[PDB]
Design a protein around this ligand. Structure first.
Ligand code: GTP
Ligand code: ADP
Ligand code: ADP
Ligand code: MG
Ligand code: MG
Ligand code: MG
Lengths: 233, 144, 550, 39, 412, 51, 520
């Protein structure tokens, strides 16, 4: 139907479109399968010249390596969009879509319709939302437990970096987050917490500064370097 | 017939604001008083040649010429000016100071007639003191 | 038909292309004519079918008119360019018979080339056509019929069906024939000292693909395709006697004339100059707002600085548009198009006499489009046509089809005399000219006889487009017509035959008066003359000379 | 009818002549041969 | 003032900027390592306009090259001219604008622009005399057009006065295959006019004609085009980096060449496209040397400004002007700027930049494509999806009605 | 989203092999295509047939 | 040679054969994209994006066919989308069949392409009659039936599981845009997207949603009763229109020139503070200095807001588009603003404007979408356009036609019965109209997996005897009446499907020859 209309085109239908979505899903799953977990493997990305950038985040792997397949670009936007607002759960989205397609494809080969299969996922999803209410546990913020925040910080930091970097960088986050809670209880992440690059002695020498650090100083030599009580303007 | 812009470069300077207002007023008057003097000679049809370095008839001037019932025709070739003066017996007018009634021609019905997409301005009847009259013959056909 | 190309000659050295002579030129000219005549031969009449032409960018054009299909066919041959420009001359003048005049010229060059091969000179052939055409126009005057004893607008309705046919909207001719006749009676104007000339490009066409061609709404008034300036303005002005102000003025922020270079020594004058700039624009609007212009029309655009007062005063704004549409709005509403607002006295002002008058104005939505519909004009009536179809290419076909239909009824009202259609004119001129020149005898009898046969190609072309037995109809046509011309003056029935002929739908001989097939007399007048001059231009060519480009 | 129009093979190399001008080259071609051996 | 930053955005932007720096560095003298092997004061005493003296004299240009396609930036960087630019300057982020004003622009302004405002700030804090910014964008592409529009706006906010010069490359109707080129080029000018202060129009279609006519290269490569664009840029910048007073410094250029605010667009003119001042006179004003598709003879010059180079006196140029004004009167306008240094390779050139009503042709064209070929609301869903509405397009066509009008208003 | 994955059964039968199965539309492709040659034998049928 | 043509002129009968085969090929691409069990379609555009959908209109936008007859079929989806907004695949799939059924005759029984057109207009005239008779009216104010009417089109999409929320989402949005005849337009319907979140918490909120934050940090992030005032102009000193050139002679002039730059922005700010607004929304950019004293009164300054987003604010807050600041009064100031609040999302900031809710101008609103990814947002946004399109037809036309192919099958039965009494030459094309109208239920049975042989035979046996509301259940694949099934669609979509499909056939049937490559 498409060849007499368009003189040049490509068309897959009714068996290859299903194999493509599953094969591309299993292919992209195998890339990020090894990175998931604390003992996962690191992954560098050197593009043109040899710029080097090292991380285990699936978003950096997806939003730096160009991809041609039509299925994976939707997994890239899905893995990116979930992480861009939440900041966690990138590879988990790829593993679910990476596994749920192959786990349903065996039954498509058996001859079950795709419509009623996806109807089962939706009604099963509503059961998980009802299960989140019973599965979660209430925690009162008035106690101001600093040990509870330390354990939450080590969950993500142990996954990315080793224990040497986690122990020294964990209280840097806890001291920054301890000041977030106030009487208004309005959370502010982008304006309050920032990151700045500085090539210095080593990664282990990261320290916490309660005030605002600036990347510039006094141009003239005679201007004072250190000031005890400085009233800003 | 155009806004004043003479041969030597003319740089207009506006020092106060009343002056912006005035410059406009004075112009809506430099075109008006010249058109007012055309009514004094009761000249009913004007024929302008091809204008160089500026527009022949300003769009602001057409409002004064259109309300007073004056036909305006521009973009006439320069060599044809000898033809019109010789045929109609009308001497050309290069300045309003020399614009008088005796130098103008006459006609019974100056009319643009249109034939299926061809616009024609034909003058019916010529009477003048001229020993060298003119003649004009149109051509019609299928293609050029 | 030409083979074995002419040899490059060493004795005759001309720069550019080689010279070629003999009968091959008139064979090549006729062969070039058949290349274009076969294209337009199929799309003739109601049974005729048209073709498509792509523009090499995905776009295409499904065209029924002979002028449009030849305009896109850029003919490199010189002889074909004569017929291409003739159709561009035909549709602009009369707007009818564009396909027939090319088909008549092609059949003339066919038989004229055959007569040159029969060893008679083209000068005698041209003299045979001119004396024959002078008798043909004399015969066209004999077969005229004045409209009389007709109930209402029936003569204007059924004559439009002949022009409405051979299109996609011929099935809906019962619905479009009323509004087309009513449209031209709405734009009646007296011009040039008593000459009632109905005009077009006065009636409008708006491309709104949507519901169907059957439900095309005739809005009794003027329509304009323009977007609203500000969306906060009201889309419906209530109350009668709505005043319309037509302008050509620019309401955009003023800038003083070029040759002006401001130079000031005092710093404090910058407030004031700036103010004066905006102020001139506002004064210019402040006088027309106080005049009560409910809906202002303009050609040059309006910037947001002046749209505040229109939103505050509930005035509708109008953006860029064509220069010609505002002239007819002023004529219908009674306004006057002002190129530049001024006064004969030494002070600017705005008079109330420049305002128009209409009953109602509203912005109707044609399914994606903003169009200001004006209805109930006071000074002169107006009309607009809302075209609807399946897709934009059909709307383009509806544009030129209505332009042909409007043009036919336009020339119908210029001259009350009419002539029947359906090949009866060509069938009668054939037998009339065959009887002619029998007394002349010697040489011009063969030239005029083939001329009489050249006009029969139209009833032959209409028959084969129907995919029916053509010679069965040609036997009925010519014979019936002959039996009418020969007859006594005193024979009612036979005389009537002179009136009827070919039918393309049912395939039998029926009366054109009851069927409603009718054409104007002006459509045939000056059509054979254009085909005659088209035949003369190619027939007199002996040799062809081509100069290569530098 | 199509753009190809062939009746005999190799129409590009084969070229006809006709009319009075075609015969004119033949007699004038004999003058060149005659004028060489005329002396 | 003393210095001007030079932003380069887009694949066309990066290419033209790399060519421009390749020209500039060799002009007043620096090996691609930054070291200065030049002779002497003349080439060094205005080097601070575009280079930051670092301790140790490793001059480094002040340029911010940006693109949403890692690849173009990468290629340029891995190539030669890869030691000069500081590694931190490049700002490049996946995926690709996708050749869409709407999408590329909004999406990555949302990200790349933040990073760019960050780089434009601190690196520049480093100077004591910002004068303005020079942007090289392509009017018709994706990243360059969209981002350019966003950045121009963002910068203008963070630097009110600072002049803003652009060298946008207008699209080629014939050689720009992509169909949605006009529909972007229109949305870009919508905002270029409201913000910019002086802009130069370069048309690839015009560049092809000059490449094949004068140079006679059989097939133009983007390289050739880039070299010619580079030469005009170099002349205009020398108008700046060589001690001089004739049009000394950017702001002056603007004042001299801009009669009224809403007319930024200039027609570059450069010769000796492959010598005596009288010889170069004809080459500058030849209708074929314009790098703009529109014919300037049919149009009208408003303010002319010719930038000569090499050995030329005051009077060579003045006498030439007197002779020329006399014959092209129907077409008193003049502005001369003699320089002392000479073109790399050639002894003397003469760049030509005149405002001309003829640009309105190059805009009547683009408006015709934009409207007529998108009355059918073609390829619009790509833009409505990103989030921007169609009212914005109506505003865009409306503002070109305006531009055209202006040029028509200054009686062509 | 530029280049397809190229049908990963391409490791199977070579590019010269073309499959035109059903469901895809083989019957519709065939019955129709042969209507051209069906008109050839139809026009050449009968005593008034065309050679 | 001769003019640029005559490459290969497809003339005679083979030209029309290619058009019927080409027109049939367009419907075969989206044959499976109909019914409740319809499959999705991922199309790859050459720029780099992706379009995931099953709507025939959105599919045919991205496709490109190098054939002129198929492009006329391509444009029919724009006829349906920009007229109602629902049933675009129904238009493409019906016409294919009409051109196909008429083909046998064109190819073999030699009926000329004009006699078929005359037969179709009488079939078109009879089609509107039976569609008018088969449709039953329905009350417009019944919210219980309106929710079931809106979700008829949602059932053929992915969000049928969230149909309980989408009908409430679409019903509240349509009544907001509805003006008290009953004309509404989707240009104010804001399609702003938010990637991520759950569909359950997604809700419509009265007012607008900006992508920007306040400029200065001291601006109030929570106002009880905002008073919005729209500005068009730059709030900053601008160069100005004419050739200016100040010439400075004394030393006390340049500091005066820079001082009046400060006083002019004071003059325009002080007159804005005559009414004392809380939020000043400027169209163009803002200066760092004027904002400073806008602060010395209690206003709030934002970045440049495009025009579109201000015309919605004008109808929400009731303010007017204002450019001249000297003519600012107290009457044109926006009021009755509910609440102001700014949430933190990692993508960008978002400023919320709520309305007090308590005739006048029609109110606008912004519908919040909280999908899974970017493609899920664009998928759900087109569902709202297809769902909200249904709500317009019931207000413009209170008639309601039965769904599930019962309307088109009713056209098939009456045209088949009346074809016997229509004896003549028009009988063969008139009877072939019923053959295509019975295919739009046949496609539902094929997608459901049932046998359409016995179902259609059982359908025609019960359609004449049982009732006029009989149809096929797409999920179960059995004959179930539409009254008990409780799913209904408007009658306006049935009119555009029959009109556009037949009118498309009348155009394409008149095609004689195809000549490609003439000129640009
Ligand atoms: N004058 C000139 N124009 C160029 C050159 N290279 C590319 N272009 C122009 O670049 C335009 C398209 O490139 P861009 O729009 O910059 O591409 P892009 O959008 O940055 O690329 P992505 O961000 O990956 O989509 C075309 O109109 C070309 O005319 C060059 O060397 N010279
Ligand atoms: N309904 C009809 N009955 C008989 N003859 C008709 C009918 N309609 C058109 N014709 C004939 O077809 C010829 C061409 O008509 P048309 O195609 O409308 O004009 P054109 O030749 O300008 O395209 C006319 O000369 C007319 O006699
Ligand atoms: N639940 C259903 N059961 C049977 N038929 C249905 C059902 N829903 C829709 N249809 C049929 O599908 C056709 C198209 O409906 P819909 O999918 O909403 O429009 P579109 O074709 O534009 O996607 C309708 O004519 C209707 O008869
Ligand atoms: Mg994590
Ligand atoms: Mg006609
Ligand atoms: Mg639907």
């Amino acid at each position: 139907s498409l060849q007499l209309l368009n003189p040049k085109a490509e068309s897959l239908r009714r068996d290859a479109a299903l194999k493509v979505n599953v094969t591309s899903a299993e292919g992209l799953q195998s890339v990020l399968e090894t990175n998931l977990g604390p003992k996962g493997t690191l992954k560098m990305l050197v593009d043109g010249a040899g710029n080097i950038k090292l991380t285990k985040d699936g978003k950096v792997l997806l939003t730096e390596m160009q991809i041609q397949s039509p299925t994976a670009v939707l997994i890239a936007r899905a893995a990116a969009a979930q992480d861009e607002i939440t900041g966690d759960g990138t590879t988990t989205v790829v593993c679910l879509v990476g596994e749920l397609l192959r786990q349903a494809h065996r039954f498509i080969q058996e001859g079950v319709h795709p419509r009623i299969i996806t109807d089962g996922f939706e009604i099963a999803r509503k059961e998980s939302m009802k299960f989140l209410d019973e599965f979660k546990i209430s925690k009162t913020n008035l106690s101001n437990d600093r040990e509870f925040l330390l354990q939450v910080a080590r969950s993500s930091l142990l996954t990315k970096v080793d224990a040497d970097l986690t122990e020294v960088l964990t209280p840097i986050v806890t001291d920054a987050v301890l000041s977030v809670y106030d009487a208004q209880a309005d959370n502010l992440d982008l304006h309050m917490v920032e990151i700045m690059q500085m090539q210095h002695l080593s990664p282990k020498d990261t320290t916490f500064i309660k005030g605002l650090v600036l990347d510039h100083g006094g141009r003239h030599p005679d201007m004072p370097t250190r000031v005890k009580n400085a009233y800003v303007l | 017939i155009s806004p004043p812009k003479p041969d030597t470069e003319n740089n207009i300077i506006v020092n106060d604001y009343r002056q912006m207002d005035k410059i406009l007023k004075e112009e809506r008057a430099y075109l008006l008083n010249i058109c007012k003097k055309i009514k004094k000679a009761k000249c009913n049809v004007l024929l302008i040649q091809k204008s160089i370095l500026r527009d022949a008839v300003n769009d602001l001037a057409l409002h004064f010429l259109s309300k007073l019932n004056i036909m305006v025709v521009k973009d006439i070739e320069r060599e044809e000016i000898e033809f019109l003066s010789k045929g109609l017996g009308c001497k050309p007018i290069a300045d309003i100071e020399l614009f008088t009634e005796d130098r103008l021609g006459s006609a019974d019905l100056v009319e643009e007639i249109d034939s299926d997409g061809s616009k024609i301005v034909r003058v019916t009847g010529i009477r003048n003191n001229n020993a060298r009259p003119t003649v004009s013959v149109v051509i019609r056909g299928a293609n050029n | 038909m030409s083979q074995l190309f002419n040899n490059s000659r060493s004795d005759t050295l001309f720069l550019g292309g080689e010279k070629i002579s003999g009968d091959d030129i008139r064979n090549q000219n006729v062969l070039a004519t058949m290349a274009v005549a076969n294209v337009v031969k199929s799309s003739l009449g109601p049974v005729g079918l048209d073709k498509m032409l792509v523009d090499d960018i995905g776009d295409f054009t499904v065209t029924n008119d002979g002028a449009t299909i030849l305009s896109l066919l850029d003919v490199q041959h010189p002889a074909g360019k004569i017929l291409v420009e003739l159709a561009q001359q035909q549709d602009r003048e009369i707007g009818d018979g564009t396909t027939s005049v090319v088909i008549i010229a092609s059949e003339l060059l066919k038989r004229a080339n055959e007569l040159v091969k029969n060893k008679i000179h083209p000068t005698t052939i041209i003299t045979g056509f001119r004396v024959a055409l002078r008798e043909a126009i004399r015969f066209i005057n004999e077969v005229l019929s004045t409209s009389v004893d007709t109930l209402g607008k029936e003569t204007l309705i059924n004559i439009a069906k002949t022009s409405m046919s051979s299109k996609i909207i011929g099935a809906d001719s019962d619905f479009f024939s009323n509004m087309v006749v009513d449209a031209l009676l709405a734009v009646k104007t007296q011009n040039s000292k008593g000459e009632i000339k109905y005009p077009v490009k006065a009636v409008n066409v708006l491309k709104a693909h949507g519901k169907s061609a059957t439900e095309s709404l005739l809005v009794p008034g003027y329509a304009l395709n323009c977007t609203v300036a500000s969306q906060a303005m009201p889309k419906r002005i209530a109350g009668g006697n709505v005043k319309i102000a037509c302008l050509d003025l620019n309401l955009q922020k003023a800038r003083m004339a070029m040759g002006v270079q401001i130079n000031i020594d005092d710093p404090e004058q910058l407030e004031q100059i700036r103010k004066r700039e905006a102020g001139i624009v506002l004064e210019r609007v402040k006088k027309i707002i106080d005049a009560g212009a409910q809906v202002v029309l303009t050609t040059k655009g309006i910037d947001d600085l002046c749209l505040k007062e229109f939103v505050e005063a509930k005035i509708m704004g109008v953006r860029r548009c064509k220069k010609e549409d505002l002239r007819r709005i002023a004529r219908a509403t009674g306004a006057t198009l002002v190129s530049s607002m001024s006064n004969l006295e030494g002070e600017e002002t705005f008079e109330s006499s420049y305002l128009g008058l209409c009953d109602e104005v509203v912005q109707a939505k044609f399914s994606d489009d903003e169009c200001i519909l004006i209805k109930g004009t006071s000074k002169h009536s107006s009309s607009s046509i809302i075209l609807r179809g399946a897709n934009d290419y059909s709307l383009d076909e509806m544009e030129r089809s209505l332009h042909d239909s409007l043009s036919v009824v336009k020339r119908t009202l210029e001259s009350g005399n009419v002539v029947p259609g359906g090949g009866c004119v060509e069938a009668a001129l054939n037998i009339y000219l065959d009887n002619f020149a029998t007394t002349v005898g010697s040489r011009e009898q063969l030239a005029i006889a083939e001329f009489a046969a050249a006009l029969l190609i139209i009833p032959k072309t209409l028959a084969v487009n129907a995919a029916k037995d053509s010679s069965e109809l040609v036997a009925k046509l010519r014979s019936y017509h002959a039996a009418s011309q020969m007859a006594k003056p005193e024979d009612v029935k036979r005389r009537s035959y002179r009136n009827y002929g070919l039918d393309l739908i049912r395939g039998k001989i029926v009366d054109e008066i009851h069927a409603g097939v009718l054409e104007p007399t002006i459509s045939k007048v000056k059509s054979l003359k254009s085909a005659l001059e088209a035949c003369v231009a190619i027939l007199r060519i002996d040799t062809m000379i081509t100069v290569d480009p530098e | 009818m199509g753009r190809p129009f062939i009746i005999v093979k190799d129409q590009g190399n084969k070229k006809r002549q006709h009319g009075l001008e075609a015969k004119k080259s033949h007699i004038l071609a004999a003058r060149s041969v005659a004028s060489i051996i005329k002396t | 003032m003393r210095e001007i930053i030079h932003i380069s955005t887009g694949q066309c932007g990066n290419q033209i900027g790399a060519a421009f720096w390749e020209t500039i560095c060799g002009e007043h003298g620096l090996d691609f390592n930054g070291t200065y092997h030049g002779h002497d004061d003349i080439q060094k005493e205005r080097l601070n306009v575009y280079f930051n003296e670092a301790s140790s004299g490793k001059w480094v240009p002040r340029s911010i090259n940006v693109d949403l396609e890692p690849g173009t930036i990468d290629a340029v960087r891995n190539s030669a001219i890869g030691n000069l630019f500081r590694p931190d300057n490049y700002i490049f982020g996946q995926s690709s604008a996708g050749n869409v004003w709407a999408k590329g622009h909004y999406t990555e302004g949302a990200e790349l622009v933040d990073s760019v405002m960050d780089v434009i700030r601190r690196e520049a804090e480093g100077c004591d005399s910002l004068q303005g910014f020079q942007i090289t964008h392509s009017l018709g592409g994706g990243t360059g057009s969209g981002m350019g529009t966003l950045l121009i706006s963002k910068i203008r906010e963070e630097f009110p006065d600072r002049m803003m010069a652009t060298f946008s490359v207008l699209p080629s109707p014939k050689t720009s295959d992509t169909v949605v080129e006009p529909y972007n080029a229109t949305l870009s000018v919508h905002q270029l006019v409201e913000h910019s202060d002086e802009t130069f129009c370069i048309d690839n279609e015009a560049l092809y004609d000059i490449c094949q006519r004068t140079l006679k290269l059989n097939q133009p490569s983007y390289g050739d085009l880039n070299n010619l664009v580079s030469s005009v840029m170099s002349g205009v910048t020398t108008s700046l980096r060589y001690p001089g007073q004739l049009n000394s410094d950017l702001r002056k250029l603007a004042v001299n060449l801009v009669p009224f605010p809403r007319l930024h667009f200039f027609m570059v003119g450069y010769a000796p496209l492959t010598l005596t001042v009288p010889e170069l006179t004809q080459q500058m004003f030849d209708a074929k040397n314009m790098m703009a598709a529109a014919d300037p003879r049919n149009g009208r010059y408003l303010t002319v400004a010719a930038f000569f180079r090499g050995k030329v006196s005051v009077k060579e140029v003045e006498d030439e002007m007197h002779k020329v004004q006399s014959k092209n009167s129907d077409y008193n306008n003049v502005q001369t700027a003699v320089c002392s240094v000479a073109p790399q390779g050639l002894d003397m050139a003469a760049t030509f930049i005149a405002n001309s009503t003829s640009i309105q042709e190059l805009f009547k064209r683009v408006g015709d494509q934009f409207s007529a070929m998108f009355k059918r609301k073609a390829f619009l869903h790509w833009y409505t999806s990103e989030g921007m509405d169609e009212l914005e397009f109506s505003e865009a066509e409306s503002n070109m009605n305006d531009l055209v009008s202006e040029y028509q208003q200054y009686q062509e | 989203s530029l280049r397809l994955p190229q049908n990963p059964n391409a490791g199977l039968f070579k590019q010269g092999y073309n499959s035109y199965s059903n469901a895809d539309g083989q019957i519709i492709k065939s019955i129709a295509a042969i209507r051209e040659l069906h008109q050839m034998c139809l026009t050449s049928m009968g005593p008034c047939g065309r050679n | 040679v001769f003019m640029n043509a005559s490459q290969e002129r497809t003339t005679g009968r083979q030209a029309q054969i290619s058009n019927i085969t080409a027109a049939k090929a367009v419907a075969d691409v989206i044959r499976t994209c109909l019914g409740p069990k319809a499959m999705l379609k991922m199309l790859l555009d050459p720029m780099g994006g992706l379009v995931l959908t099953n709507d025939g209109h959105a599919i045919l936008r991205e496709i490109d066919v190098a054939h002129p007859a198929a492009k006329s079929m391509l444009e029919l989806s724009r006829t349906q989308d920009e007229e109602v907004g629902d049933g675009t695949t129904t238009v493409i799939i019906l016409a294919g069949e009409i051109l196909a059924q008429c083909a046998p005759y064109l190819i073999e029984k030699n009926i000329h392409p004009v006699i078929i057109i005359q037969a179709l207009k009488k079939a078109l005239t009879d089609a509107l009659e039976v569609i008018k008779q088969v449709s039953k009216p329905v009350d417009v104010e019944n919210d219980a039936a309106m929710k079931k009417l809106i979700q008829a089109s949602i059932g053929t999409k992915y969000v049928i599981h969230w149909s309980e929320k989408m009908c409430e989402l679409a019903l509240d949005a349509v009544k907001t845009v509805r003006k008290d005849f009953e004309i509404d337009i989707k240009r104010y319907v804001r399609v702003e997207k938010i990637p991520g979140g759950d569909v359950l918490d997604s809700r419509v909120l009265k007012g607008v949603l900006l992508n920007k934050d306040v400029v200065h940090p001291k601006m109030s992030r929570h106002i009880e009763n905002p008073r919005v005032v729209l500005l068009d102009c730059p709030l900053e000193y601008k160069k100005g229109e004419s050739q200016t050139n100040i010439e400075i002679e004394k030393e006390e002039d340049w500091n005066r020139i820079l001082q009046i730059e400060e006083e002019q922005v004071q003059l325009m700010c002080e007159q804005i503070l005559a009414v004392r607004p809380t939020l000043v929304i400027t169209e163009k950019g803002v200066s760092d200095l004027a904002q400073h004293y806008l602060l010395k009164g209690g206003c709030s300054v934002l970045r440049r807001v495009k025009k579109s987003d201000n015309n919605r604010i004008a109808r929400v807050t009731g303010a007017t588009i204002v450019n001249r600041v000297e003519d600012l009064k107290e009457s044109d100031v926006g009021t009755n603003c509910g609440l102001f609040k700014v949430e933190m999302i990692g993508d960008e900031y978002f400023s919320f404007l709520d309305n007090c809710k308590e005739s006048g101008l029609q109110k606008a609103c912004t519908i919040m979408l909280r999908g899974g990814s970017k493609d899920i947002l664009n998928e759900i946004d087109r569902n709202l356009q297809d769902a909200m399109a249904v709500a317009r037809n019931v207000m413009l036309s209170p008639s309601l036609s039965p769904g599930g192919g019962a309307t088109e099958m009713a056209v098939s039965v009456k045209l088949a019965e009346k074809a016997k009494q229509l004896e003549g030459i028009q009988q063969w094309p008139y009877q072939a109209v019923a053959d295509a109208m019975e295919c739009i239920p046949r496609t539902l049975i094929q997608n459901a997996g049932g046998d359409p042989i016995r179902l259609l035979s059982q359908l025609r046996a019960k359609h004449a005897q049982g009732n006029f509301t009989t149809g096929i259940d797409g999920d179960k694949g059995k004959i179930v009446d539409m009254v008990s099934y409780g799913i209904w669609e408007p009658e306006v979509i049935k009119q555009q499907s029959v009109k556009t499909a037949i009118e498309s056939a009348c155009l394409l049937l008149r095609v004689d020859d195809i000549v490609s490559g003439v000129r640009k």
